Amino acid sequence: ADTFLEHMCRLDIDSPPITARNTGIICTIGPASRSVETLKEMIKSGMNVARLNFSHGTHEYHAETIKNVRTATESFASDPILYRPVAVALDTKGPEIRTGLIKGSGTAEVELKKGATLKITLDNAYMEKCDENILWLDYKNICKVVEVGSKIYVDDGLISLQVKQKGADFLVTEVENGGSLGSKKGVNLPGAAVDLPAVSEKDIQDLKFGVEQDVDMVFASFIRKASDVHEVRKVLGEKGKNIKIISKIENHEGVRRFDEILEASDGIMVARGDLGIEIPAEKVFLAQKMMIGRCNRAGKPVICATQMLESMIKKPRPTRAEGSDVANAVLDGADCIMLSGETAKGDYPLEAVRMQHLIAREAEAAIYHLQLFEELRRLAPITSDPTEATAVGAVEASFKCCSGAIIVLTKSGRSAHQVARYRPRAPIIAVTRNPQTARQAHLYRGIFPVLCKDPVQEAWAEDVDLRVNFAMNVGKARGFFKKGDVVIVLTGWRPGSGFTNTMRVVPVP
Amino acid sequence: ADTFLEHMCRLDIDSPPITARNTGIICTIGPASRSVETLKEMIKSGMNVARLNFSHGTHEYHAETIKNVRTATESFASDPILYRPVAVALDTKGPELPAVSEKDIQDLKFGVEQDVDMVFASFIRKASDVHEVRKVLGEKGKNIKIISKIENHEGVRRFDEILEASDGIMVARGDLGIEIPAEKVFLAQKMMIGRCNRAGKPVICATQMLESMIKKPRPTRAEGSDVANAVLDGADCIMLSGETAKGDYPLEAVRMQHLIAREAEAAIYHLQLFEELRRLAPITSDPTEATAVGAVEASFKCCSGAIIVLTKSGRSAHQVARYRPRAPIIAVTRNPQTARQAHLYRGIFPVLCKDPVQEAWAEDVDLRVNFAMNVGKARGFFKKGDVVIVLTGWRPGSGFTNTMRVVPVP
Amino acid sequence: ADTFLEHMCRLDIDSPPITARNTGIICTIGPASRSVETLKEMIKSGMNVARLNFSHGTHEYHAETIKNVRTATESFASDPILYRPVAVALDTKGPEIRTGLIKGSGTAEVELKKGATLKITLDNAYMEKCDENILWLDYKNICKVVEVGSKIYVDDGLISLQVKQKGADFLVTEVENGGSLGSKKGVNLPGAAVDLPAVSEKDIQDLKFGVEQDVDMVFASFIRKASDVHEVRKVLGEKGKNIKIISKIENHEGVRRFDEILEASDGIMVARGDLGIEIPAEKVFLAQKMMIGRCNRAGKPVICATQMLESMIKKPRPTRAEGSDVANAVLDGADCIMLSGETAKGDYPLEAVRMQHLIAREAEAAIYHLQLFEELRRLAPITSDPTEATAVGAVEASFKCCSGAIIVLTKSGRSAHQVARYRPRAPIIAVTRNPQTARQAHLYRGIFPVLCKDPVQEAWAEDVDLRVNFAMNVGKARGFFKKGDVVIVLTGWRPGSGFTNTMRVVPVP
Amino acid sequence: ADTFLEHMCRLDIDSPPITARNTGIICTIGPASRSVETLKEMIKSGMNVARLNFSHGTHEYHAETIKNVRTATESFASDPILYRPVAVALDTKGPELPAVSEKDIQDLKFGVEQDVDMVFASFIRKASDVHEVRKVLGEKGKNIKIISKIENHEGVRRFDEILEASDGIMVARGDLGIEIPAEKVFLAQKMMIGRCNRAGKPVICATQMLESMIKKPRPTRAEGSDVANAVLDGADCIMLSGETAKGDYPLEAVRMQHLIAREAEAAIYHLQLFEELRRLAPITSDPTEATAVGAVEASFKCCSGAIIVLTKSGRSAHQVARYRPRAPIIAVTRNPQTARQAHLYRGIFPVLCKDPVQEAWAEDVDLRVNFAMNVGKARGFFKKGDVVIVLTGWRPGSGFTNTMRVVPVP
C-alpha cells in the first residue's frame, strides 16, 4: 500500500487477521473478574492493565483485588519468555454526585416514566427511600449551582430531568428521558459550576493507599484544570513520584482547558459518554480526534474509555456498531482501550477481553503507518538532543530494512516511549530490569515490554548482548520475526550513559 | 494543516461549523414524513433524495407518496436560483432464491412508469443479479441508476464484479452485521467505500445511522460518531431509515444528519484524497479525464471557489467529483433527471437551467456560466473577484467536455 | 528516467540525437556571412536571429546587411508551413576603450614580448603609430581611474600589462603576457571604475537607426546598473517601445548589481570572456549558473555569448572542450547560444552554424525536464491571474496526456512566453499574425513560432480553429506529432478578452 | 535551497568560498615536481595522490621519485592531527595488441615491490583486460586498487563490464575526443561518471584540465569551467598531467585546481544527489549498508558537522560516501594504505591513528573518536557543542560497521 486509498481497497475480510494487536487493553476488575482463576484467563486473553474503581468498595476490598491480580500475573513468571507484565491502576472517586438507595423490598428498580414528575431532595430521611416521587442525592450545595430550566442526568446519562421549580432542599423536575433508576447512581450537571474540590478528603486517603499498595498509575477523575493535576501530584508526593497520572477529561471545562491539563499530566483518558452529556453529542467525535491527536503529537499516552462493548454486560458478543466505535477509536490514534462494566460486573468478562483483542487486532489492518510517522517527524521540533535523533532514525530504519522490531534497552522506559511517539509499524520490544517500568510501558502504543530477571554481567557489552538475545528469543517465540530478518537495537554507549544514543542494525540469528 | 495530524489537532469544537455540508442526504419517506408540509420542511433542512421502501405498501400508496414529494419539491421552483432538485429512489423488496422476484418485476415496471431516478436493488449477490435488474428496467428506464445493496457474505466476497456492473453501491451495515462477524463489518465498510471512491462510482451508507431518533429529538454520542466516521471513510451519501419514515421526529433527524455531515467536513483532509486518487488514476489521454484532472488540480492552486461543469448527462461532473476537490462542483444541466441523479455524488451541487437555448453557442454557454455564478454568489460559495474553473465542450454537439477556463467571478 | 542520475546512466552515445533542438541560435553577421546565398544556407541550417555588431561598420554598411538578411529570410515565405521567422539584433558599441593603428606599411602586427616595456600615451601624434615602444588608446581619463601596479588587458585579453609609473598622458607598463598586437583592439581595466557614460553620442545615433531599420532587439553593451537600461529605453522611446532590450553583463559592477539590471531589462546576455577578464576566471562558471538561473526564474530570456566555437574561425570542426562548454551552457538553462567570429569573419561560417545545432541537439538528451518544471512551479509566486494559472495547467497537462505540443494563439507573444517560463518538454507552437512577435519569440527556449498570413474571419471561433489547424499542419509536417496524438491549445475566450485563459485538450485530426 | 534553481539563484560570487574542497586532487610527478621541497609545497597546497607515468623513465628513476614523495609526505608526520596521507599511483604504458605487454608485467611487479596504492591501467578495452591486470598484481598486490582508463570506443561501448571488473574508472577526455566524435564526449563523461556514482566506485577525470598552466601562472576562463563541470558531473578526483609534471608553474597548478574544486562545491546541490542515490540503491538489509544510509540521512537532519567512520579497510567509509553526504566523512584508520587509498572517494577526509591499541575495546573506540574530534575541531569542520555521527563495529573483530551513534562534540 503506497497510498492510503490502496490500503483500504486491499482489505480482505476473508483472509485471517495476520497482523498482531498493537494497543493496550485496560480492564476494570470487580465482582465478576476478581478471582485468581478468572484474572489468569483475562491475562492470557490480553489484559495489560488492571483498573480498580475506588468509587466503590473499601480499601480492604481493593487490597485483596490487587493481591489476586498479582497472584494471577506471577503464575506465568515460571516462563520469563512468555511472561507478560500486568499493571495496576487506581481510579479516583473524584467530585461525585450520587443518588440514594431505592425504597423497600424486591428489585432495586423504579420505572421513571417519560414526562412524569420527580422531587430531588437533600432530606436524609429519604436517603434510602428513592422512588418515582422523591429522589435523594449527596450534593448538599445542589440548589445554589443549578437554575430553573437546567438539565440533570442520571446513571451514565440514561435518564434526564429538567428543573421546573427551585427550593431550599427540594428541586421539582420533569423526567425528559425514561429508564430504570437503580440504587446509588452517578449524577451530572452540565454547565453547572460544581463547587466540590479536586481532591476530596476521601481521594487523599485513596491516593495514599495507592502509594502504599505500589500502583503503577492513577486515573484522576473530573480533571478541570492544571492545578487539579498538581494537587493529585502533591498527594502522591515524593514516595509515589514515579506513579503516572492519567487525567480524565469528563466535562466541558476539561475540554476547554485541555492543553494545560495535557502539559501537566503524564497521560489522558477521554471519557466519551461523560462528554456526550456535558457537550453536544454530534461534536464528541471531533473532541475525541482532537484530544487523541494532541496526545500523539505531545507523545503522551491517551486512553479511550466508556461505551466500548457495554452490550457484553449481558451478551456473549458485541453489536456491529460497538465494534466500529472501538475500531475507529484505535485508528483515531488511541494508545489503549478501556473496558468498564463489560469486565467489572458483567455476565461475560472473559469474552469481553477476547473481543476487545479481536477488534483491536482487526483495526491494525486498517492502520496506514507510513503517513503517521512522516507527519509526526515533520511536526517534531528539530532538536539535536541525541536520544530524539536516534529514536527518529530507528523508526526511519524500521520501515526501510523491513524491520521485524526495534529493541530498546531501557531502565525507566523513557527511551522506548520516545521511539513509540513516532509510530513505527514494527513492534517496540522494551527490555527492562525495572518491573514497574515493564508494567507502565503498556500505556504506549506498540511497546511490547519484557522483564530481564538475570542480574548484571560485569562486561557491559555482554550484558547488552544477553538482553538483546532475550528479546530475540521472545520475538522469535511471539512470531514477530524469524532467522534472517533484521532488527534495530537501541542502547546507551558505556554503563553510566545519560543518552540512549546507539543504533545498531542486527540480523536475527 | 500541511499534515493530517495537524488537521486533527486544530479541531476546535467551540467555533461554529463554518464549512458547508458536502455529502448527499437520503431520507426514507413513510407515515411520518409523507405529507406535503413535512416534505417541504425536510427539503429545506437538506433532503436530497426521497427513498421509497417497496418492502411495504401498495403501488397506489407509493404513487401518492411520490406525487407528494414532487408537489413539495416544486413549491420552491418559483426561484430557480434557490431551487434544489430532489430525487426519487425505488427500493426493491428483494428475495426474502432468484434476483428479481415476480413482485420485484412489477415494482420495477412501476418505477419506470413513475419516472424514478434510481433503484436500490436489494440482496445483490453477484454481477448477473445486477444485469437482471437492468433488463427488467429495460429500454425505457435505461438511464435509471442501479445502486446495488451489499447485504450478505456472498455480496462482500464478489464485490468487485458487483461494483463493475452497478452504477453505485449501498453498504447496509446492519444486514452485514448479521451475515458477517460484527468485529469485521467496519473493515468491509472501509473497503467498499474505498473501492467505490477509486472506481469513481457513488457509495451510500445505510442502516443504523440515527435510529435512536425514532423516539428522541437528538441522537446518542455513538450514533453521531458512527455517521461522521462513515463520511470520513469516504461515503458520498448517508441514508436515514425509520428515523424519517415512521419516527416521532422526522424533521429533527434530517437536521442532525445535516449537522453531523457538516462537522465531518472539518475533519476531512482534502489534498491527500486528491493526490492519491490522481496517482492511482490510469494515464488515459481521453480529453475529458485529462481536463477533469487539471480542473481539480487548478481548483487547489488558484484558490478556487468552485468548479462549474456544463453537463447534459452529468458524466462530466461525475469525472471531476471522482478526484475529490475541496471546492464545490456546480453541475449546470438542462436535463432535470441529470440534476436529480447528481446528488449521489459527493461535492456535486446541481443546478437546473430553465432559460431555453440561445442560437449562438458561446452565448448559451456564458448564460449558463452566469447562472452558476449567481447561484454561487447567493449560496456564499464565492464573491466578486474570486476565481472559478469552468468546464465546457468546444463547439455545439461536442463529444468531449474538453475545455477548461479560468474565470474571475464578475 | 524517474531520477536525474538514471537520466545520465541511460545516455547512449551510439544511438542518434533523436530529440530535436530546443534552444535559439544567434549568429553574428559580417564579411563571411553577409551575402544572400550564405544567409539562405545559415537560415536552413538553423540561424534564428541575425546579430549586427555596431562596434564596426557605418550605418550604410549595416542597412545593406539587414536588407540581405531579409531578402534571404523571405526567400522561404512562398511556403508558409515551412517558413521560419528570422530576427535582427542591433548590438551597441557601448563605452569602449580601444587602441590605435599599428605604425607604417606592411604587416599590421607588432610582437609584444614577455617581460618587455610599453608606454601607453594619449598624445594623438601616436594615434596611428602603435608599436613595441608606444601604444595609443582612446580613453582620455585613463590616468585617473588606474593606479600603480594595476592590470591592463588587450584584444579579448590576449595581452596583459602592469602599470609601473603613472603620468598626465604617459603610463609606463611591463608586458606580463605576450602576443601579436593588431590595430584598434579592445582594452579592459579590471576593477577600475570607467567614468564613461551609458549611452555615448554614437550609441544614441545607432539606436535611432535601429528603430528606423525595424530591428527586433538591442543587445546593450557594458550594462552596469538599472539606470543604464532605462537610458537605452528612453532613446528607443515611443516608436521602438516593443523592441526588446537584452542587457549584456560584461564586468564586475554588472554582476554585483545583476538583480536590478534583470528587473529593468527584457533579457540578459552573459559575456563569459569579458567577465573572465573583469572577474577571477575560477568564479565565472558560478556567475553564469547564477545569472542563467535567476533569468529562468524571472522568466526572461538569457543568452550565452563569446568563447563558444572560436576554433572554427580556422577549422571545419570544434575542439572537444568547446563542445562541452556549449553543451553545459545549454544545460545550465540558457535560452539561446550566440556565435561571434565563428560566423562573422571565419573561414567556415556555415559549418559553425551546423555544429552549434548539433551540440544544442545533443544537450537536449542530457536535459531532465520534469525537475525543471516542478521546481519552477513551486518557486512561482501564487497569483490567481488567469493567464499564469492556465499556463501552469497547460504545462502540467503536457507531461500527463503525453503531449506532442502546446499551441498558443498569441498576438504579442506574452502568453507563449508565460508557458515557456515553466519549461515543458513539448514544443510550444506560438501562432501569431504579428511578424515581429514571431521574430522575437526565438529568444525563448522551446518556443517554435509560426506566422499566420490568412486574414481574419469575422466569426471568432472559426478564426481560432483556422489558426489551430495551421499549427496542426506545421506540427505534422515538422514531425512534432501525427494523427491520433493529443495536443494542448491555449486561446482567449471571446474576441475582446484580456487573458489567454482557455485550455483545450485536442486530439490531432 | 529547497530547489536546485534556488541553489543557483543564491550563488554569490562576492562572498568568500566558505565551503571546503571535497574532491581528490591527483598530480603527475615529473621533472618539475620531483624534488622533496616542491612535493612538500604541493602536499600543503592539496595534492592527495602522486601519479607516476611509466610510459617514460626507468625503474631506478621512479624508485627515487617514490622515495622523494614519501620523504616529503612524512615531513608532516611530526603532527598527527595535521598529517595528511599522500597516495602513490602507478600508471601503465599500455599497448602503443595485448592488454598487458611484457613491459607492463615488469612495471606492475615493480608497483607491488614499491607498495603503490593504485594502478591506472591504460587502454582498457574489455573486462578480461582488467582480470589480466589483476592476476599480474596477484596475491601480494591484491589490495592495490585497479582504475581502468577508458581511452577509446571499445572502452565506452563495453563500459559496464569494465566497471563491474575494476575498482574504479578514469575518463581520459582527450583520448576519447580522438576516438569518438568531439560533440559526444561530454555525454560520455556524464554517463560514465553517473554510472560510477551509482555503482559506488570512484571515478577520475583526466587530461585537458589546466594545460595552459604549463606556461602560465593562471588558467583560462574555459579551463576553469571545464574542471568545475567535471566536479558537478559527479567526479571523485581531478587529475593534472603536464601542468604539474613538467610545466613552469607546478605549484600554482595545484593551488588553482584546489580553488576551482572549492568553488564547484558552492554549486553542488547535495540533498538531490543523496535522495536519488538512496532510491536507486537495491534494498538490502545487510547491516552495514543500512547503517551507512541512516548515517547520511541523519547527517542532514541533526545538521551534522561530520560522519566519523572507524574503518580498517575503508570499505565502511566508502559505503557512506556512495550516498554523497554534504558533511565531511572522517575515515579513522590504523592501516596507512587504507588512509592513502581513501582519497579516491569524494568527501572522505582520511586520518591515520598512530596511538597503539588499548585492550578495552570501547576505550580504543573512544580514543579514535576523540582523535577525529580533535582533527575536525582543528580543521574547522566543527566546534564544541556541534553534533556528529559516529559509525563503529559492535564487539572487537566485528564484520559489520553496524553501530550509529549521535555524539555531541566535547
Ligand SMILES: N[C@@H](Cc1c[nH]c2ccccc12)C(=O)O
Ligand atoms: N502493550 C501491549 C500491546 C502490544 C503492543 N505491541 C504488541 C506487540 C505484540 C503483541 C502485543 C502488543 C502488550 O504488551 O501486550
Ligand SMILES: N[C@@H](Cc1c[nH]c2ccccc12)C(=O)O
Ligand atoms: N449534493 C448535495 C450536497 C452538496 C454537494 N455540494 C454542495 C455544495 C454546497 C452545499 C451542498 C452541497 C446538495 O446539492 O445539496
Ligand SMILES: N[C@@H](Cc1c[nH]c2ccccc12)C(=O)O
Ligand atoms: N525558436 C527556435 C527554437 C525552437 C524551440 N522549439 C523548437 C522546436 C523545433 C525546432 C526549433 C525549436 C526555432 O524555431 O528554431
Ligand SMILES: N[C@@H](Cc1c[nH]c2ccccc12)C(=O)O
Ligand atoms: N579526500 C580529500 C578531499 C576531501 C574530502 N573531504 C574533505 C574535507 C575537507 C578537506 C578536503 C576534503 C582530502 O582528504 O583532502
Ligand SMILES: [K+]
Ligand atoms: K471513578
Ligand SMILES: [K+]
Ligand atoms: K427494501
Ligand SMILES: [K+]
Ligand atoms: K559591441
Ligand SMILES: [K+]
Ligand atoms: K600512460
